Every structure is written in C-alpha cells, then in structure tokens.
Design a protein around this ligand. Structure first.
Ligand code: MG
Ligand code: MG
Ligand code: MG
Ligand code: MG
Ligand code: MG
Ligand code: MG
Ligand code: MG
Ligand code: MG
Ligand code: MG
Ligand code: MG
Ligand code: MG
Ligand code: MG
Ligand code: MG
Lengths: 174, 156, 70, 88, 129, 67, 226
RNA sequence: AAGGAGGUAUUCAUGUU
RNA sequence: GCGGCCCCCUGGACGAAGACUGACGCUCAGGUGCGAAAGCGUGGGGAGCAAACAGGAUUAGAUACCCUGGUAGUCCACGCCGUAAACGAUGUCGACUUGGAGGUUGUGCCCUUGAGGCGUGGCUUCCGGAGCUAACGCGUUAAGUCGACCGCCUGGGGAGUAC
C-alpha cells in the first residue's frame, strides 16, 4: 500500500492555509531575550522579535508551548525562512475590537492626536480615526490645547475600513 | 619507483615600489613508468625550493593512463589553450618520437613507442597539460567493450 | 509658476511657495540645458550612460539585499 | 493594398471554386493587379523608395511563381500569361 | 535552410548527450532509420522507435554508462558541400577499430567492418567514437 | 500607480473629454509623465495625442502664459 | 533507524525554496509548485535517505570517522547534540575554508589549543598578572568554540554528512578534492553535483534537521555497537 | 549650494484647498 | 534613418481559427537599387547657427581655445557624389542545447470576485550554467554543437600609396 505522496500532499494542503497576510496559529517552540521561535509549520520555524510579545509593562506573557496567532506575510523569503508577524495579528484584533465597539458603543480610550483632514484625528492601540472639528469637546472652552493628544474614551462613530481610517466622535458619553 | 623529470624553469618578475622581485617557477612531471603520470607547477624564491615544491605537487595529483604494451590504444588528439597535440601508436622499436615536453611526459608515463607532433603554441606548460589530457581521454578495448555492451572479441 | 499671494500668508511663505512652484516646473534646468547647442550624438550618449548607471545601481541594490555584508 | 472585393473577384475569376485562394495563377493575378495599381503612385511620388522596395519584392515574387508554373505545366503558364497580358 | 538532415540528426544526438537528455526526437526518414538501426546494433544508443502515420517522428533513447555519454564523438564526414566515396581498400579505421564509421554501400547502410568483410565500398555518412 | 484606464476598459481616449485630460496635465500645461501617473504606455501615447489635439482646438492651454 | 513519509511530511521536508531561485540540476527531485514555492517529491526522498543510511551504517561498522557539518544558525546546536551523542565529530560554526585540505594547519592549531588547555589545568595562569591570564583564557575559549568538535579526529574523516549543501559548498569541494564521500541534505536551490549521497529535502527547519540528525546518529550508534 | 529621511514609490481616500 | 497635429497615396510586421497550392526553397560572383554629413551644378529662400574672414584679448609666440561680427553652408526643387568608429567593430538562412528578472505588442482559459491567477506567439534589455575563448568575455537574439552559400586575412611600414 504505497500511499502516493500526491494524495497525501493534497490532504496536507487542505489541512493548512497558505496566503500572505493570513492569520494563522503557531506553537511557540522557544523563547529568548532577543527573539521568539514560533512554528506555524510551513517551511521553517520562524523567529519574531521580542517586543512584539510585550505589553505596556514590557512583559513576555507568552510561555514555551503556548499556542499563539501570528499573521504570515510570506511562506518564504529567499533565505529559507517563513516570515511571521505578531503585530499584524494585533492590528487585526484591534480592528475587530473597534468593530465590536461600534456595535456596542463601548468607550475605548485613545489619544486624540490632533488636526485631521476634516477636523481632528484620534489614535488608539494601532487604530486611527477622524472626528469633525466641531466636535472638539463637550464643554468647549476657548482653549483647544487640551483637545489634542489626550486620552478620550469614545465610541466608534463610523469606520471606512478600506481607507484604514475610522470616524471618532465626542459622542453622547463624551 | 617514481621517475621524475624537470621540463622547464623560468625566472618571473614582479615590479614593486622598491624595485623588482625575481622568483623562480619549475614545471615537473613524475610517473611510475607503468601507466600513471602527473605534472606539477611549483613557485618559489629559489630554484631548489621551486623544484622541490613542484616534485611534491606532482607526486600528488597523479592520474591513470590505459597503456597497451607500452604503446597507445589508438590515435588521440588533445588541446589546451593554443597548443594542439596529436599522438599515434607505433610499432615496437621506433622509440619515442616527440618534442621536449611530450618527450618527458611520455617517457615518464611509460610509453615506449609513439609518434607525436605538437601544433600551435609549443609553450611547455600548455603542451604538458594538453598531452596529459589526451592521454587521459583515451579508452582501451576493455572499457569500450564494457561501455557498448559487447565482448572484446566482438569489438576486435 | 503664477503664484497668488493669499490673505494673511506672510511674505516668506509666499516666496517659499513661489520657489517650490518654480522648482517643480523646472524652468532653470530647461534654460541651462538650452544655453548651448548639444549635438544629437552627445544627447544620445548622455541618455544611454544615465540609463546604464541607473540600472547598474538598481541591480547592485537588489544584489545587496541578497548578500549580507556582515 | 487590394480591397477585399477585388481580391474575391480575382479569386473567383482564376480559381476553380470560391475557396481556392492559393493556386499559382491566383497568386500571380493578385500580384499583377497590385503591381499595375501602384504604377500611378510611383508616377506621382517618385522619391518613395521605401514603397518601391515592396513593389520590387512583388515583381520578383511574381517572377518566381511564373517560373515554377512554366516548369511544372506549360499549358497553364501560357494561358495565364496570355490572359494577364504579360511578356514572357 | 535545412540542407543536411543527417547532420542535424547527429547534432541532436551530440547535444542531447551533452545535455544529459534521456531521449531525443527528430523528423523521420528511411535513411535516418537505417542509421539509428546501425547505432543500436553497434551499441551506441539504447533504443529507437518511430511514432506517426503521415509525419513520423524518430525517438532515440540515449545510453550512459558511468554517468558519461556513450558516444564520445560523432562527426558528419560526407556532407552536401563535399561528398566522400571510398573504395573497399581505403575504408577508414575509426579509433583503430574501437569506434565505427557508418558506410552506405550498395546493399544498405552498415559499419566499416561489415563493408570491409563484404568487400564493398560506398559513401561515408559519419564517424562515431 | 494604478493606471486608471485599463481598469475601466477604456478603448480610446477622447480629446473632447477635457476633465480627464485636466487630471493628466500639470499647472503649467505640460503633460505629466507616465512614471508619475502610473499610466500604461499605450494609453500614455493616446493621452498625449488627445492632449495635443485639445491644445489645437483650444480646449486646453499650450502654456499658462498666453492665457 | 527508520524514517517514513508521514514523519517527513509532518516535519516539513517537502517545502523547498521559491521558484525564482531553484536549480535546474535539482529539477528531477521537484514535484511541483504551489504559491511560487517548490514541493520536493518525497517519493524520491524516502529511498535515497534509506540508501544513505545504509552506507553510513556500513562505514560506522568499518570504524569510519563521520564529520557532521551543519553551520546554519538553525542547526548548529542540533548537530552538536547529535555528534556528541553519537561518538562522532562535528562542525557547528563557520566552516574554516581549508579544514580538510589544509589539515596540517588545522592540526597545528589543535596542538596550540591542547597546550593552552594544559596551561589551564596546570596552574600557569598565576605567574601572569591576571590580564595576560584573562587573554589566555579568552583565547582558549575562542579556540574551543572554533575547533571544539574536531579536536579528537586526528586525521581526515571517512565521510561527511552536510546540511544545506549550498551553504557548505566549500566543504563539499574539499571533500571531493580529497576523495571523502559526502552525504548531503540538499534543498531545491542547491547543486547536487559535488554530493555523492543526495538526500533531497528542506534543510532550513529545525524539525527536519532534528529528524535527519536523529536518524543518522541512531544508525551510526548501532553500526558502532555492531 | 549644503544637510537629513524614504524609496526605486507610491496606495495613503476624497474632502479641504 | 525616422519625433507637433490633420488629411490623401502607400510599404512591411505580428496574432487567432480555418481553407488553399504542393518544394514553388536558401545563398549569390558579375549586375541593379538605396545610402548620414560634408561637397558639386542650376534656380529660389535666408530667422538662428556658423568653416573662411575682420577685429578684441590671452600668450614668450597663439595663423587656436575665449569675446564681438560674419560669407559659403545649413532649408527647398531637380541632378551629381557614393563615402563614415556606415559599429553589435559580430555576412545571410536553417536545426539542436539548463535557467532568472524585466520591457513592449497580440491572443486563450479560470471565480473578472477588485488593477487577479493559469497559459500560448512576436520583438526586445540585463544576469548567469554547460560549453567556447589567448584572455577579456559570449552565453536559446551565442562568440555553444552542426548544415548551405557568399565576402575577406597571410609580419610592421612604405600603402589603401604609385601606374
Ligand atoms: Mg594551480
Ligand atoms: Mg606560433
Ligand atoms: Mg500583403
Ligand atoms: Mg556586388
Ligand atoms: Mg548636404
Ligand atoms: Mg548648393
Ligand atoms: Mg546658391
Ligand atoms: Mg566665433
Ligand atoms: Mg570603407
Ligand atoms: Mg567594417
Ligand atoms: Mg539576399
Ligand atoms: Mg551574460
Ligand atoms: Mg587612391
């Protein structure tokens, strides 16, 4: 029963997913001070820099043997390496969270960076939005300095997902 | 058992800021007179050191020639750069009729009767390379019969 | 380059805009190139040499991102 | 060149069906028609060497075809050159 | 223009051996089939066959012994620009009999050994070593 | 990038369609390069011909100076 | 021991390099392309691996010295572990151009390292003013890092087992010059000309190198057990 | 003219202007 | 060699599927034709540039480089001329031999999901394997392996000169 590699490989190909940008799970093989070896099992156990696994306190919550989720960029690089990125998965999660916040009016805290093309702009955890300049604040003192760069817990007014931008607002809560 | 022979020794030069630096190169050929021959090129500051290095280098990197009773199996042609060499088997007793580099290489490789001629440049280094190449690219009845799937009697 | 001075814009800003407009239109390069007659063979030779060295630099960069220097 | 209607007309005249377009007589007739057509062009525009070269290619190809036809079947050759009014 | 199909066939054989191809293909003719038969019987190619009704294609499956090509050298001798004919006495010895010259005699194409044994001359198509 | 003509199945550029050509001429009135616009070569040649015909018909300016 | 198609495919042996870097010499062992990545035909890997394993078994039975060469950042420690726990020698840092051909030089360096080691376990680093002692210690550390796995071979090895033939093309040429057989794990972008026992397969994944090294070390241990 | 940055170069909307 | 746009006359190339003729082909001494610029003859035209020439400088000198002018000429029509580093310093035609990245111009299929993916022809630039080469380098557009025909070479100079 010489099971042909053709059909075995076909089974394998339907077992996994191979496309740039795809969010794929992986097994954390080893952790070092410098990089973290992860394995999505395509051609090579990739290595991702350490800061991509650190929180605000710079903590490596990830441990050995943990199953993490990273976005594959390219299955190969010319250097015999599968290229994986954790920050891309973070952006994916942040945008899904922004979607849910739009659905449920969840007040997310982000730095309203400053003037945008049509008003002011906001940025929160790797996401960016614009709010009309008429919506600077609820109690609009003549000082606009405290309108930009500070923490605002706003609900997602809209999102032009294709444009990689959203529409923030000084909503009912704000 | 290895017969050795120095074919040529030349004095090359390398101009430096302080003047010229003259070094000596030696081309030698060694062989066991029974079908194995190699050539070596050695470079040194002095002639004895150069010939010593060349003799060692030639004692290494020997190759095997399919000799038939001290004569070649069949006419062979060889070529390296601008030197073209023609070697033909000859009947017993004619001796080795060849020019100096071919003479040395064949005498040390064990060919006792051969007709030879070099065309093109007769520069010794290339002549030695070409004749050694021709002697190496020579096939005997045993190997030709084996290669074509026949018997030696079938090949005659 | 026809620059209109806008309201409340200072003179420095207007002059900067006019300079950028002139540099974007490339007037001075045209004038310097038309100061003297250049033979067709000279024009063709200069064009070909520019293309050759630009292509060589691009190829060198592409090779460099393939071969590490450290 | 030659318009579609003229080509179809010549094919009908010289080939033994509507669909025989490759026969030697048909080719020679097409070449002769085009050659005769261009004489006005090369009588007005006398410095159009780049077109005169294509004209000479047409003439030479007609020569090769007539030679082949003459060596292969003399009767067709005589009939064809008499119809077309060509010397030799 | 193709004016020596036999030379083209030999050239395909030589280039296929230099490029380590398993088999080579060429347009067929009866002279080519005779030459391929001679090569097969002398052990220079592993096999030949012909495929096709109206436009036959000759396929030769080439032979390698120790990785190296079996046909070391193969050169057209008689060519359209210079035909070569040899009497039975002057038939050549290629590689002193270790190789074979393909001679076209009056009784078909054969090797120089066969022509010398049959007492015939003829045209010299090619040398094979 | 993004040659805007292939994606819309444009067969021939029209010298009468001024606004499109207004997108592909600069302020001084010269033609913007294909290396800048990302236009494909064939449509670039068509565009150049159309712009020259529009200049002839005085629907676009040769230069900014004359008017 | 024995490896199989299932284990190879689990470890990711079948993934080669992109199609724009492949070797036409490597063409025969290539199954197909999927998303601009070559797929190595394991139907060729399995029998070739077994034949190389058998030859390594025979050499180990004939008391041949095996040089495990793998110097990628992805297989240095794997090869060190396999050659440690197989009683053979290894190179897991840069391959010194001329290790084999310039053995004489390598051997003189070996002797220098051994003399430094005697100075270490001799109480020599005391008469020196602690800074020449630190320099000597650091020199010994560098020499150990560089020639650690080959300080007991003594002469030339009887066979080389090399990972990433292309990365180690120099070692292959040295072995062919000196007539030492080479068993090489070859990717799709590498040349199998200088290899005597080709083992087509991915040479970049630690799982794959671990598989190969484990199988080879088990075969060599069994062959020396005899 | 000098200095920095990005690339083989732009997608980065439109709006605004 | 060809560079604004438009019209009239006209040559060649390539692709798709099909039909037709049935070796009608390749090369080509002599021969014929085309052939940058300068130049020549006759007749116009002449804005700019500019051999010759005039003047001003620089220089030991400056029959030059630089400056101010400036004629033939450049332009057109018709003829002559027949040469160039007229170069890929690579004669024309045909067959075979691993690959990669592109450009341009056709054409087929799949989900065109949205400028996509998978093929198949023409021309074209770079890198590189085997092979070739004195080396430099060429490398499916060969300088590789071959077939056909045509042109040339035989030390430097005198000399592409004399008759
Ligand atoms: Mg040497
Ligand atoms: Mg000579
Ligand atoms: Mg036509
Ligand atoms: Mg002539
Ligand atoms: Mg003129
Ligand atoms: Mg005149
Ligand atoms: Mg006049
Ligand atoms: Mg002047
Ligand atoms: Mg001439
Ligand atoms: Mg010439
Ligand atoms: Mg011709
Ligand atoms: Mg190249
Ligand atoms: Mg003369």
């Amino acid at each position: 029963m010489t099971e042909s590699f053709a059909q075995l490989f076909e089974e394998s190909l339907k077992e996994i997913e191979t496309r740039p940008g795809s969010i794929v799970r992986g097994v954390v093989v080893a952790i070092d001070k410098d990089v973290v070896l992860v394995d999505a099992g395509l051609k090579s156990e990739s290595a991702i820099p350490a800061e991509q696994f650190k929180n605000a306190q710079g903590e490596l919550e990830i441990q050995v043997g943990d199953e993490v989720d990273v976005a594959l960029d390219a299955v190969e690089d010319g250097f015999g390496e599968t290229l994986l990125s954790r920050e891309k998965a973070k952006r994916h999660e942040a945008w899904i969270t922004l979607e849910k916040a739009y659905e449920d009016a969840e007040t997310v805290t982000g730095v309203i960076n400053g003037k945008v093309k049509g008003g002011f702009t906001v940025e929160l955890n790797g996401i960016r939005a614009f709010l009309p300049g008429s919506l600077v604040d609820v109690r609009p003192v003549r000082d606009t300095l405290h309108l930009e760069g500070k923490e605002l817990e706003f609900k997602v007014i809209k999102l032009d997902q294709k444009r990689n931008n959203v529409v923030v607002s000084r909503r009912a809560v704000i | 058992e290895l017969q050795e022979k120095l074919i040529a020794v030349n004095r090359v030069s390398k101009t430096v800021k302080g003047g010229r630096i003259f070094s000596f190169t030696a081309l030698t050929v060694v062989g066991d007179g029974n079908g194995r021959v190699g050539f070596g090129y050695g470079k040194a500051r002095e002639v004895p050191a150069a010939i010593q290095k060349a003799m060692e280098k030639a004692r290494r990197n020997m190759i095997n020639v399919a000799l038939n009773n001290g004569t070649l199996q069949h006419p062979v042609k060889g070529v390296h750069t601008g030197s073209r060499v023609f070697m033909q088997p000859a009947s017993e007793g004619t001796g080795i009729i060849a020019g100096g580099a071919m003479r040395a290489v064949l005498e040390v490789a064990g060919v006792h009767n051969v007709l030879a001629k070099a065309y093109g440049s007769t520069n010794p280094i290339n002549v030695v390379r070409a004749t050694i190449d021709g002697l190496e690219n020579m096939n005997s009845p045993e190997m030709v019969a084996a290669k074509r799937g026949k018997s030696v009697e079938e090949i005659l | 380059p026809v620059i209109k001075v806008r309201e409340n814009e200072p003179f420095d800003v207007a002059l900067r805009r006019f300079k950028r407009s002139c540099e974007k239109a490339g007037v001075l390069a045209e004038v310097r190139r038309r100061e003297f007659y250049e033979k067709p063979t000279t024009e063709r030779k200069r064009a070909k040499a520019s293309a050759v060295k630009r292509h060589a630099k691009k190829l060198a960069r592409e090779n460099a991102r393939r071969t590490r220097l450290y | 060149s030659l318009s579609t209607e003229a080509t179809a007309k010549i094919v009908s005249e010289f080939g033994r069906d509507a669909n025989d377009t490759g026969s030697t007589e048909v080719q020679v007739a097409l070449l002769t028609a085009q050659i005769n057509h261009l004489q006005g062009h090369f009588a007005e525009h006398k410095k159009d060497h780049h077109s005169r070269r294509g004209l000479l290619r047409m003439v030479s190809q007609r020569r090769k075809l007539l030679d082949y036809l003459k060596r292969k079947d003399v009767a067709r050759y005589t009939q064809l050159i008499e119809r077309l009014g060509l010397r030799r | 223009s193709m004016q020596d199909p036999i030379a083209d066939m030999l050239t395909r054989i030589r280039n296929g051996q230099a490029a380590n191809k398993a088999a080579v293909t060429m347009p067929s003719s009866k002279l080519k089939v005779a030459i391929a038969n001679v090569l097969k019987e002398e052990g220079f190619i592993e096999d030949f066959k012909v495929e096709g009704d109206t436009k036959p294609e000759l396929e030769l499956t080439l032979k390698y012994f120790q990785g190296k090509a079996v046909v070391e050298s193969i050169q057209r001798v008689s060519r359209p620009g210079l035909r070569i004919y040899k009497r039975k006495d002057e038939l050549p010895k290629v590689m002193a009999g270790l190789g074979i010259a393909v001679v076209s005699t009056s009784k078909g194409v054969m090797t120089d050994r066969a022509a010398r044994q049959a007492g015939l001359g003829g045209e010299i198509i090619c040398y094979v070593a | 990038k993004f040659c805007r003509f292939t994606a819309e199945g444009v067969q021939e550029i029209d010298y009468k369609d001024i606004a499109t050509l207004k997108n592909y001429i600069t302020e001084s009135g010269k033609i913007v390069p294909s290396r800048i616009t990302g236009t494909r070569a064939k449509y670039q040649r068509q565009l150049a011909r159309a712009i020259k015909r529009a200049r002839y018909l005085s629907l676009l300016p040769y230069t900014d100076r004359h008017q | 021991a024995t490896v199989s198609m299932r284990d190879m495919l689990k470890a990711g042996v079948h993934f080669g390099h992109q199609t724009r870097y492949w070797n036409p010499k490597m063409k025969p062992f290539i199954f197909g392309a999927r998303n601009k990545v070559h797929i190595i035909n394991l139907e060729k890997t399995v029998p070739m691996f077994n034949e190389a394993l058998a030859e390594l078994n025979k050499i180990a039975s004939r008391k041949g010295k095996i040089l495990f060469v793998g110097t990628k950042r992805a297989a240095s420690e794997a090869v060190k572990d396999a050659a440690l726990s197989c009683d053979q020698f290894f190179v897991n840092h840069r391959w010194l151009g001329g290790m084999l051909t310039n053995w004489k030089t390598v051997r003189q360096s070996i002797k220098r390292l051994k003399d430094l080691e005697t100075q270490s376990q001799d109480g020599t680093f005391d008469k020196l003013t602690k800074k020449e002692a630190l320099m000597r210690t650091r020199e010994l550390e560098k020499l150990e890092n560089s020639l650690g796995g080959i300080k007991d071979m003594g002469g030339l090895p009887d066979a080389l087992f090399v990972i990433d033939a292309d990365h180690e093309h120099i070692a292959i040429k040295e072995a062919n010059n000196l007539g030492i057989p080479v068993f090489a794990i070859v990717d799709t972008n590498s040349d199998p000309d200088g290899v005597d026992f080709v083992i087509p397969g991915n040479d970049d994944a630690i799982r794959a190198v671990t598989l190969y090294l484990g199988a080879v070390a088990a075969t060599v241990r069994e062959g020396r057990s005899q």
